[PDB]
Design a protein around this ligand. Structure first.
Ligand SMILES: NC(=O)c1ccc[n+]([C@@H]2O[C@@H](COP(=O)([O-])OP(=O)(O)OC[C@H]3O[C@@H](n4cnc5c(N)ncnc54)[C@H](O)[C@H]3O)[C@H](O)[C@H]2O)c1
Lengths: 83, 75
């Protein structure tokens, strides 16, 4: 109701730090915090023992994920099925 | 001691150092607790490498180089 529609169809109307997407404002610590924390929870989640990880139907268009997986092979409980 | 027969020949013919006489006198014992090994390389350190047996249950396939090269290439 309030702001999305104006952005869509209000022509010349833009402002500063009001929206957070997609990975937009990383030069500001406040925003980055969110993505860094989600990735931190993900990375320390795979460190768990007896945990199953799934990578299904992925094009592997990212770089950090592949390198992290390669460096995290120390876990003998990695199983992957990809389409 | 690789120089086993040489010590025997020296003592039989005469001569030899104190170590040769000591090994000769302590080797003459006919006990199962003492083992005699002779050869040009059996008593050397090289022959000891192969004497180690692999564990029955421990895996024998080598998959460390594959992991290292995968990490080097993909990561
Ligand atoms: N907390 C986090 O997890 C985190 C961390 C850093 C960045 N980000 C976000 O990441 C930044 C950009 O990421 P992105 O959009 O480039 O990643 P992405 O969404 O493009 O990665 C997945 C993509 O791969 C495409 N693809 C191509 N071939 C495919 C195939 N055969 N199978 C499946 N998918 C295939 C898909 O269209 C699409 O899903 C954003 O700016 C930011 O919001 C998130």
């Amino acid at each position: 109701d309030e702001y999305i529609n104006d952005i869509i169809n209000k022509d010349d109307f833009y402002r500063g730090q009001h929206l957070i997407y997609p990975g937009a404002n990383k030069y500001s610590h406040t925003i980055g915090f969110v993505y860094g924390e989600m990735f931190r929870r993900f990375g320390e989640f795979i460190s768990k023992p007896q945990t199953a990880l799934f990578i299904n139907g992925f094009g592997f268009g990212d770089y950090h994920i592949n390198r992290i997986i390669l460096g995290a092979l120390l876990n003998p409980s990695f199983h992957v099925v990809i389409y | 001691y690789p120089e086993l027969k040489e010590a025997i020949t020296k003592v039989s013919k005469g001569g030899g150092s104190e170590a040769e006489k000591a090994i000769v006198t302590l080797k003459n014992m006919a006990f199962n607790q003492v083992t005699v090994v002779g050869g040009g390389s059996k008593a050397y350190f090289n022959s000891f490498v192969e004497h180690l047996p692999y564990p029955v249950l421990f895996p024998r396939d080598n998959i460390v180089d594959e992991l290292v090269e995968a990490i080097a290439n993909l990561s």
